[PDB]
Design a protein around this ligand. Structure first.
Ligand code: JHE
Lengths: 444, 65, 74, 196, 59, 239, 415, 378, 99, 46
């Protein structure tokens, strides 16, 4: 029973569509539990400046009652059947999903439908959830990680909708009326922009019929003027430096323009990012770690933590790394990190790329474990790719990557290219942009 | 053989700045050569004349060479 | 003393662009010429007066040396 | 909140190519780098041109000056030296012997024994024209000026230690290690020779 | 086709090895061009004044 | 002791990138040869120096052969006299300065090698001196042999006017007027003092062009690097 | 080829269990009765160092080879400690299981614990503890146990400050040699055949063999000036494997055991509503239920404002008293059962959590109880059993722990 | 981590020339340090190459220098680069000092004092350099200037004949002047390194005179690229002189050989000494004149002590600014007057200028500082 | 009193106000001033830090602020006086005690 | 091979809580678990 074989007999993903244009997608196995939910092409990128943070504001109101189940009736019903109700918003994707017993899937699909379509959005409930968001925005200021990433976007995609934070500026939070929220909803929550995804013990045929029963009313036309169509986003080589010596560790986040969801190069870039990898001070490896960045970082106590990323958006993204370190280490961290990018561009080896491949194989095979991550993979893949890509296909793309590919792909995006830099905290040492930009090429 | 120099020195000599300076020269010519026993001479007045003359000579002597 | 041990600074954000994203000479004549005239006007009557004085003490002293070397009519 | 921070408008400073916020900067990236690196590359070519000339001049300084090149060569008139007689000259602060050789001296120095000599050189490779032998008039052992038309071998003889040179300038019997020196020369017009 | 500066970058300036060989080649072509071109400008400015121009009269 | 400084004559080499008139040098040499060389030395110019400037190699060899020069010693231990060659310098009139004084009533004729460089005004000065000899003004006379020149310091010189109309016939048949003879000899004395003149100016042009190229390029490189900082915005955002 | 779990207990005591499910990935876990409870007051924090100490040099593999070799094949090695067990786990693609297995056996059966390597590792105790104690839940729960017990379960998972830098190589050897034995070990696997696991366990995991937890009731009070006060109050509950334990688990979900809806107000949580009635400022309350081989702790954990800690704790305690007096309808106990039933199945939904339950059961009991049998045992809890659990808690000797500005946090004897 | 910060030699270079934290706002007046180094290297090279062809024997000396210019390959361009390079040096020096005065850089005491030493050493070098060609101004310049030391009581007359190595400036003087002239630039190089060693203890001053620790940028690339541009402009100035007017800043009398009988009309040192030469000639008494010429340079050592203003730079100080530019214009007057014959009106102007020089430094600019303070309620 | 005309003139002539600096920002840092600065409260120190940063950046560009934004003679608070006065008063006490 | 839920630093200032909505989920309900690894950041569970 080999690995190549194992991939062939992974459960396939079923794909059907409704009249209005809602896609229904399903992965089945004999399991006592399930996860089902609605994924929507909606988020901060689709928001203008006047209504930024609306999708986030909505997310707060989603579980606060419906027309059919007023106030805490929605809440009570989820709790009493042992179900778990959850939501998230990114810059491009809003998503609501429910984890339930398999037998309770009809009611599960019904409740999701009631949340999306018949959302109360009460006057008093709005004014209550207004203060809640303001306090979350204050909590967020205390998370240096969150702040530096919001900054990276803000400078990287400056003067576009991708510069905007998901949560919105406090000005908007304090002013957004119920008129704004209902207008936002009817414009962006449409059947062709949406996907109903489900995983666990679930007959696909049943889900599709349940979608008919409850999601038929979903609007799938747009009027004469306007049809949501994202403009491309201009990446800018830029720096944002929030100097705040009062904080005890420095956060730096640096990235070049990535290719975005569609592009095959994403597979080779994943392999490269796996080579460099990630680290923190609790890792068992230390000096003997495989990644030269990690082993050098560990032995010289350069940083407390770092990760490589590759963030994907529609026709663009952020490819790089984030690190957290001592105020005297920022220069040396940058040096070694940029040194790694250069080494992969120019001189990546077969055996290290093989390691990267093996990491990535492992990464996405074990991440898709349990119904929730698989439900999410179904939901979002249908929005981003237009399909679920089977594990067997990922494996074919991975086997195709050799040392030559990693070089050529990395050179495209990293070598002699302007990055976006965000730093926060005691960043006195944080290298000058010219020194950073000169560190994106080698003289050889 | 006529020298272009001595032609131009004549040409320049009949200008307002020259003729005024040439009269200053002739004043002291028949002031010192008329008076007896004064140790004063007329170097100064000659050089005033030549400064004005040879400045003009320079400006167009080199045309004939 | 190294970068990182210079001094204490708090709550100051710095935004900047890559040199490949921008032009070397933005508004070089448009904003340059007026800023030059502003800077010239600002220092002119601190800088200039002594050098006017030099010019005068010089041109006075020069032709005074010439006059002194001539004979006096007496 | 920190969400209130929005990056200032940089439009005044931006390149034309990256003004359009709805278009990808990736189109213009190949170009914008090209322009700026061209400036750098052009500069380096200019600096190279300069430094080449500066270095090259300084190097030139150390090579022979005009007045040292002036004494490099000496012209000799061949019609001014009769057949048989030697004529001395002053060359690079040395005597310089030019000798018109007779048809007897030519044939007599032609069929000499090659091996017997201390410094084995045949006559047709010591000279360019058979009737003219040009040599430096410094005795090779410890430096004297050899006297013409004397000695045992009938060429040049030295009263310092006891050396005997033949008519071809080769050491035959004495303490000298290497023959009298054959300089670098060429005949120009059949009447004249330049040594040097 | 991409722009002129872009062709220059991808073909000559991206790899630092090609960038350097470019400089060395270009400097040779520049040197002979500049020298010959500037000498022409000098000798025209001083037409008939130089030994080079009056050489023929005594040969 | 009043002073008349020379006017600025429009020389063929006055301009920034203007070379010396080499034919004028060739005439000017002959004015040194025929007129000066029996009074003034010119120790730093040899017969080889003329080659590729005013005369060919063969012409300069002929000019060198024409003159006497001492050489030695020969094997006898004597100093002989021989016909000159390219390597010989222009020969001094007298054996020493003390001899020179006796031949000119006390006054020593200066060496002319650097005369253009060693006198304020240069070729403007010498030209004025040579052509400026005139009758003295009234009230004036010097010692018997000290002549009147208005351009010489102290107004009196111990040199007989050396040039006049047809003091020589020129090789190329130029009408030898006093003005023409002075102009030519000055052009030669300019070259005598500064042989580098024509090369110097060639270099100047090539430097001006290279600087015309490099300065705005290096200035552009400067603005490029600095543009990170010139653009930057600061904001103070306390809690 | 549709597959369910296989099971073996060797004559030497060791359990092997394995479901061959033909997934691309393979998780293998060696579970050992070697948790913090098996330390005494002379070797405290030894198990903490031992948890950091895999990937030190072994007999068959170097420190370098363990790290490089596992990373080479994209794999992972984890070491997990409770108070009662230690769990060594390896993941990889199924083609590399016998490479990872070789490493797993080396780590657990033959570590060298070299003096220079063990000494070099000592500062990692401080880093790992420091990080963990950033969660205030860690302070309170570690103190809660220390308060509630005299010895075994009182032990902290993290090495006491005074012992950091002082855990010797001998102590590490002693701990492994005394606790990592066939009689105390269960070797679990997914995506690997049962016959080949059995043969590994017979040939490489046959090694020879080597006090009851006394409940005390105390309180521990960390004064630290936070504007929020974490606090937990428990009484002795029952032992895992007894039927009474199931009653406590149901009582936990009647009272309220964490959130069901994102940003939700917890309308069915009995505790949260009881507290939210009196005091509206920021807070959280949950029922706390630990269950061990010897003993158990049941109670509740509050997070409250410094000034409101008195009000919140007493409000929470009062809600348990009404449950103990008899105020409890079927619809509540039905809801609570539905939660627990769903929660259990959801915890074994992933193949990570499934491995944890298979191995967990294998140590504390004889064999594997299927999900269907567990749900039937939840249903077996009558309303009467829930009221007895509550009654037990109310009249039982109390243990408490707090961290925060405790100026208005009451003592046990103030309650 | 890198071998720029690790390697013992690269570490020094990385800290002094690359990662050096420099103020963001330093102006063009900060380029002159860089340029003085370039001048120094430039002199050493051209100088060494000239020394390969020169001879210090009195008879052959003048002839060797001309032999360089006429027969040595590109010997002329080397020779005139070296002579105009000495002018470019002194231009660079006075600009560099002026910057220090105006912006109050002299508060960096050790840096400043070593500066004064450097100044004095460059002066000694350039004085002895001008003698080497052995023309008129060389010989007679050296004679008059040296012989000022005979005005010292008791010993002065001995001292003069000890420098000379004889009874006039002759054979032994020229040879030793060649030896001292060769060695001194190397000594300068060493002292210049001590100069920077102290500068990098504090880092650089800037135009505001306000501490720049809140806004330092790394030296590379910002000021490496500025210094390249500066060096480029320095080469232009130098080569403009060398190729278009090599005789402009020199004197004609140094093209006739040195004559111990025939005295030149108006004997004077090279342009960069003329200000202090004028101060010497103001005072009628000779020993007084020497002590004034001495104090006209050494007063630089006194400047830090004379600082009164509560602000460091003259940027925010109108009265001082004017008095500074008066002091500059006065120095330009002393250079003019220094070049003139000793007669009316150049005697009186020179006396009046010399009074004004010391008056500005010792009385007026200190007073101006204190007036400015009291205008700001300080 | 009567010299307030000249003080107002001098203020604008000096022109540190054109960079948005207050007088006490321009004070040359000796050992007393260093200590006085070190004793400033968070707010006054960080203000000082920024005002200077802004001025240095303006100096770097060779520009000034808009005239509305210039420091107004009347609004120039003497923020460093109380700290510096005491630092000096303290040192003079130690210097006295040292005799 | 997957990075953890939270990247760990030592001496990094703690994250604030301001409301009920962020504070629920925190109250411990089950006894502690501790993992350490080769690849994944170290975690402590309820
Ligand atoms: C060291 C420094 C230099 C500097 C000076 C000279 C050089 C090049 C050089 C030229 C000659 C040279 O010769 C010798 F003998 F070794 F000194 C040595 C180096 C480079 C940088 N600049 O420009 C500065 C400009 C502004 C502020 C501080 C500095 C600052 O601190």
């Amino acid at each position: 029973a080999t690995y190549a074989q194992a991939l062939q007999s992974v459960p396939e993903t079923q794909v059907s569509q409704l009249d209005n244009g809602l896609r229904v997608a399903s992965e089945q196995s004999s399991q006592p539990t399930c996860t089902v939910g609605v994924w929507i092409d909606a988020g901060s990128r689709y928001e203008s400046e006047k209504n930024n943070g609306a999708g986030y504001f909505v997310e707060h109101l989603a579980f606060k009652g419906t027309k059919n189940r007023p106030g805490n009736a929605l809440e009570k019903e989820v709790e009493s059947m042992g179900a778990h109700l959850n939501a998230y918003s990114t810059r491009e994707h809003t998503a609501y999903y429910i984890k339930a017993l398999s037998k309770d899937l009809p009611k599960a699909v019904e409740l999701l439908a009631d949340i999306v379509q018949n959302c109360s959005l009460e006057d008093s409930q709005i004014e209550k959830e207004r203060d809640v968001i303001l306090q979350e925005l204050q909590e967020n200021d205390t998370s240096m990680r969150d702040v530096v990433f919001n900054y990276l976007h803000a400078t990287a995609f400056q003067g576009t909708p991708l510069a905007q934070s998901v949560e919105g500026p406090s000005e908007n939070v304090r002013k957004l009326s119920r008129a704004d929220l209902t207008e936002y909803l009817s414009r962006h929550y449409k059947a062709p922009r949406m996907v109903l995804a489900a995983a666990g013990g679930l007959e696909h045929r049943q889900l599709l019929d349940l979608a008919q029963k409850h999601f038929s009313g979903l609007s799938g036309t747009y009027d004469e003027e306007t049809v949501p169509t994202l403009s491309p986003c201009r990446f800018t080589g830029s720096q944002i430096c929030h100097r705040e010596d009062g904080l005890p560790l420095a956060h730096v986040a640096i990235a070049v323009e990535g290719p975005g969801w569609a592009h095959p190069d994403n597979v080779a870039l994943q392999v490269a990012n796996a080579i460099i990898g990630h680290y923190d001070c609790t890792y068992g490896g230390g000096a003997h770690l495989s990644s030269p960045l990690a082993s050098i970082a560990a032995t010289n106590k350069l940083c407390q933590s770092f990760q490589t990323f590759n963030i994907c958006y529609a026709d663009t993204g952020l490819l790089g790394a984030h690190f957290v370190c001592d105020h005297m280490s920022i220069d040396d961290m940058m040096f070694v990190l940029q040194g790694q990018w250069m080494r992969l561009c120019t001189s990546a080896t077969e055996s290290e790329v093989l390691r990267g491949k093996n990491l990535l194989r492992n990464a996405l095979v074990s991440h898709l474990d349990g119904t929730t991550p698989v439900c999410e993979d179904i939901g979002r893949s249908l929005l981003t790719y237009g399909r679920r890509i089977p594990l067997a296909e990922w494996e074919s793309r991975i086997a195709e990557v050799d040392a030559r590919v990693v070089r050529e792909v990395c050179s495209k995006y990293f070598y002699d290219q302007c990055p976006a830099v965000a730093g926060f905290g005691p960043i006195e040492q944080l290298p000058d942009y010219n020194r950073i930009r000169s560190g994106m090429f080698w003289l050889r | 053989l006529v020298d272009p120099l001595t032609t131009v020195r004549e040409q320049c000599e009949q200008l307002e700045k020259c003729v005024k300076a040439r009269e200053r020269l002739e004043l002291c010519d028949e002031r010192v050569s008329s008076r007896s026993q004064t140790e004063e001479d007329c170097t100064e007045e000659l050089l005033d004349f030549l400064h004005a003359r040879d400045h003009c000579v320079a400006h167009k002597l080199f045309n004939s060479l | 003393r190294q970068f990182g041990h210079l001094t204490r600074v708090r709550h100051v954000i710095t935004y900047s662009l890559s040199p490949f994203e921008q032009r070397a000479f933005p508004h070089y004549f448009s904003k340059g010429i007026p800023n030059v005239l502003r800077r010239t006007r600002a220092c002119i009557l601190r800088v200039a007066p002594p050098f006017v004085a030099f010019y005068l003490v010089y041109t006075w002293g020069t032709q005074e040396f010439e006059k002194s070397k001539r004979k006096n009519p007496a | 909140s920190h969400t209130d921070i929005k990056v200032p408008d940089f439009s005044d400073y931006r390149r034309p190519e990256v003004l359009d916020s709805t278009k990808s900067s990736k189109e213009s990236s190949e170009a914008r780098k090209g322009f700026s690196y061209l400036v750098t590359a052009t500069t380096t070519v200019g600096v190279a041109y300069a430094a080449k000339n500066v270095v090259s001049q300084f190097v030139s300084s150390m090579s022979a000056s005009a007045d040292v090149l002036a004494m490099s060569k000496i012209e000799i008139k061949l019609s001014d030296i009769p057949e048989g007689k030697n004529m001395a000259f002053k060359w690079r602060g040395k005597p310089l012997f030019v000798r018109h050789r007779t048809k007897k001296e030519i044939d007599q120095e032609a069929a000499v024994e090659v091996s017997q000599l201390r410094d084995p050189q045949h006559d047709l490779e010591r000279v360019k024209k058979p009737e003219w032998v040009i040599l430096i008039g410094v005795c090779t052992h410890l430096g004297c000026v050899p006297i013409a038309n004397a000695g045992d071998f009938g060429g040049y003889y030295c009263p310092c230690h006891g050396s005997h040179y033949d008519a071809s300038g080769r050491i035959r019997k004495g303490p000298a290690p290497l023959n009298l020196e054959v300089p670098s020369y060429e005949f120009t017009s059949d009447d004249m020779v330049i040594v040097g | 086709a991409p722009t002129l500066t872009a062709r220059l970058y991808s073909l000559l300036f991206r790899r630092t090895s090609t960038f350097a060989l470019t400089i060395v080649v270009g400097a040779l072509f520049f040197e002979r061009a500049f020298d010959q071109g500037a000498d022409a400008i000098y000798e025209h400015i001083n037409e008939g004044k130089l030994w080079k121009h009056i050489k023929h009269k005594y040969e | 002791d009043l002073e008349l400084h020379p006017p600025s004559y429009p020389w063929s080499h006055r301009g920034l990138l203007s070379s010396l008139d080499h034919t004028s040098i060739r005439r000017g040499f002959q004015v040194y040869k025929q007129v000066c060389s029996s009074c003034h030395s010119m120790d730093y110019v040899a017969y080889r120096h003329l080659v590729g400037v005013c005369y060919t190699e063969d012409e300069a060899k002929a000019l060198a052969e024409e003159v006497e020069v001492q050489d030695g010693p020969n094997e006898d231990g004597e100093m002989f006299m021989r016909p000159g060659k390219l390597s010989d310098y222009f020969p001094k009139p007298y054996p020493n300065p003390e001899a020179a004084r006796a031949a000119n009533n006390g006054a020593l004729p200066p060496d002319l090698s650097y005369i253009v460089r060693a006198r304020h005004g240069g070729e403007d000065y010498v030209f004025s001196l040579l052509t400026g000899y005139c009758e003295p003004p009234t009230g004036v006379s010097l010692r018997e042999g000290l002549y009147f020149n208005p351009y010489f310091p102290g107004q009196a010189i111990g040199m007989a006017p050396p040039i006049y109309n047809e003091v020589l016939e020129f090789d190329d048949g130029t009408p030898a007027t006093m003005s023409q003879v002075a102009k030519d000899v000055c052009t030669f004395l300019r070259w005598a003092a500064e042989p580098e003149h024509d090369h110097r100016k060639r270099m100047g042009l090539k430097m001006l062009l290279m600087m015309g190229l490099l300065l705005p390029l290096v200035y552009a490189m400067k603005r490029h690097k600095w543009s990170v900082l010139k653009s930057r915005k600061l904001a103070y955002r306390p809690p | 080829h549709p597959q369910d779990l296989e099971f073996t207990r060797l004559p030497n005591g060791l359990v092997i269990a394995s479901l061959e499910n033909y997934a691309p990935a393979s998780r293998i876990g060696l579970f050992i009765k070697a948790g913090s409870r098996y330390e005494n007051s002379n070797n405290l924090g030894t198990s903490h160092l031992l948890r950091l100490a895999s990937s030190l040099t072994t007999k068959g593999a170097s420190s370098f080879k363990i790290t490089r070799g596992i990373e080479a094949v994209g794999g992972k090695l984890s070491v997990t400690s409770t108070r009662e067990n230690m769990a060594y786990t390896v993941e990889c693609l199924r083609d590399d299981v016998d490479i990872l297995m070789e490493f797993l056996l080396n780590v657990t059966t033959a570590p060298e614990f070299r003096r220079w390597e063990v000494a070099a590792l000592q500062p990692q105790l401080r880093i790992d503890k420091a990080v963990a104690l950033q969660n205030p839940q860690a302070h309170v729960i570690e103190n809660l146990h220390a308060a509630a017990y005299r010895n075994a379960l009182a032990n902290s998972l993290y090495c006491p400050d005074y012992r950091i830098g002082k855990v010797t190589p001998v102590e590490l050897h002693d701990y492994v040699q005394n606790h990592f034995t066939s009689a105390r070990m269960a070797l679990i696997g997914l995506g690997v055949s049962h016959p080949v696991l059995k043969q590994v366990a017979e040939q490489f995991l046959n090694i020879r063999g080597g006090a009851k937890a006394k409940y005390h009731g105390g309180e521990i009070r960390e004064q630290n000036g936070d504007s929020l006060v974490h606090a937990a109050l428990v009484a002795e509950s029952a032992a895992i494997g007894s039927a009474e334990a199931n009653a406590f688990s149901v009582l936990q979900h009647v009272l309220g055991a964490g959130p069901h809806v994102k940003r939700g107000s917890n309308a069915t949580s009995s505790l949260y509503q009881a507290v939210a009635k009196g005091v509206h400022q920021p807070f959280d309350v949950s029922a706390f239920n630990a269950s061990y081989s010897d003993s158990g702790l049941f109670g509740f954990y509050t997070i409250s404002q410094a000034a409101s800690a008195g009000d919140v704790i007493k409000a929470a305690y009062n809600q348990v008293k009404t449950i103990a007096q008899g105020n409890l309808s079927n619809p509540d106990v039905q809801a609570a059962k539905n939660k627990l039933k769903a929660g259990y199945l959801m915890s074994v939904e992933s193949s990570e959590g499934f491995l944890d339950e298979v191995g967990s059961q294998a140590l504390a009991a004889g064999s594997y109880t299927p999900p269907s049998t567990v749900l039937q045992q939840i249903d077996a809890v009558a309303d009467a059993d829930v009221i007895n659990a509550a009654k037990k808690f109310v009249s039982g000797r109390k243990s408490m722990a707090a961290s925060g500005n405790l100026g208005h946090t009451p003592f046990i004897d103030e309650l | 981590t890198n071998i720029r910060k690790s390697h013992p030699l690269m570490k020094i270079v990385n800290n002094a020339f690359i990662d050096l934290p420099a103020p963001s706002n330093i102006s063009s007046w900060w380029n002159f340090g860089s340029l003085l180094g370039i001048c120094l290297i430039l002199q050493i090279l051209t100088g060494l190459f000239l020394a390969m062809h020169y001879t210090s024997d009195t008879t052959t000396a003048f002839s060797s220098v001309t032999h360089i210019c006429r027969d040595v390959n590109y010997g002329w361009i080397i020779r005139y680069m070296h002579a105009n390079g000495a002018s470019m040096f002194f231009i660079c020096l006075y600009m560099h000092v002026g910057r220090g005065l105006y912006y109050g850089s002299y508060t960096f005491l050790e840096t400043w004092n070593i500066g004064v030493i450097l100044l004095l050493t460059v002066m000694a070098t350039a004085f002895m350099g001008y003698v080497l060609p052995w023309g008129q101004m060389s010989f007679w310049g050296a004679t008059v200037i040296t012989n000022l030391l005979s005005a010292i009581p008791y010993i002065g007359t001995n001292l003069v004949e000890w420098i000379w190595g004889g009874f006039s400036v002759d054979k032994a003087t020229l040879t030793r002047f060649f030896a001292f002239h060769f060695i001194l630039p190397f000594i300068i190089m060493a002292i210049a390194m001590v100069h920077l060693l102290f500068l990098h203890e504090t880092g650089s001053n800037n135009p505001t005179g306000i501490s720049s620790d809140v806004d330092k940028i790394p030296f590379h690339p910002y000021y490496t690229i500025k210094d390249i541009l500066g060096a480029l402009l320095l080469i232009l100035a130098l080569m403009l002189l060398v190729l278009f007017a090599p005789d402009l800043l020199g004197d004609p009398d140094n093209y006739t050989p040195a004559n111990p009988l025939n005295t030149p009309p108006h004997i004077k040192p090279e342009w960069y000494f003329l200000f202090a030469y004028a101060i010497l000639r103001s005072i009628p008494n000779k020993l007084g004149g020497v002590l004034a010429l001495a104090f006209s340079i050494l007063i630089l050592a006194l400047i830090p002590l004379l600082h009164t203003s509560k602000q460091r730079s003259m940027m925010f100080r109108p009265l001082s600014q004017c008095l500074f530019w008066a002091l500059v214009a006065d120095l330009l007057t002393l250079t003019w007057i220094g070049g003139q014959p000793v007669e009316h009106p150049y005697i009186t102007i020179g006396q009046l200028a010399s009074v004004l020089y010391f008056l500005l430094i010792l009385v007026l600019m200190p007073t101006a500082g204190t007036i400015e303070n009291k205008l700001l309620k300080w | 009193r009567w010299l307030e005309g000249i003080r107002k003139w001098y203020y604008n002539a000096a022109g540190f106000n054109k960079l948005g600096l207050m007088r006490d920002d321009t004070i040359h840092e000796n050992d007393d001033v260093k200590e006085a600065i070190r004793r400033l409260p968070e707010n006054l120190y960080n203000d000082r830090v920024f005002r200077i940063k802004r001025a240095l950046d303006l100096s770097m560009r060779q520009q000034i602020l808009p005239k509305e934004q210039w420091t107004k003679y009347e609004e120039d608070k003497s923020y460093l006086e109380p700290y510096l006065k005491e630092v000096i008063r303290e040192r003079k006490e130690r210097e006295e005690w040292a005799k | 091979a997957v990075p953890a839920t939270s990247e760990s630093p030592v001496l990094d200032l703690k994250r604030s809580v301001l409301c009920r909505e962020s504070l629920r989920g925190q109250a411990a309900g089950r006894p502690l678990v501790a993992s350490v690894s080769l690849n994944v950041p170290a975690s402590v569970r309820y």
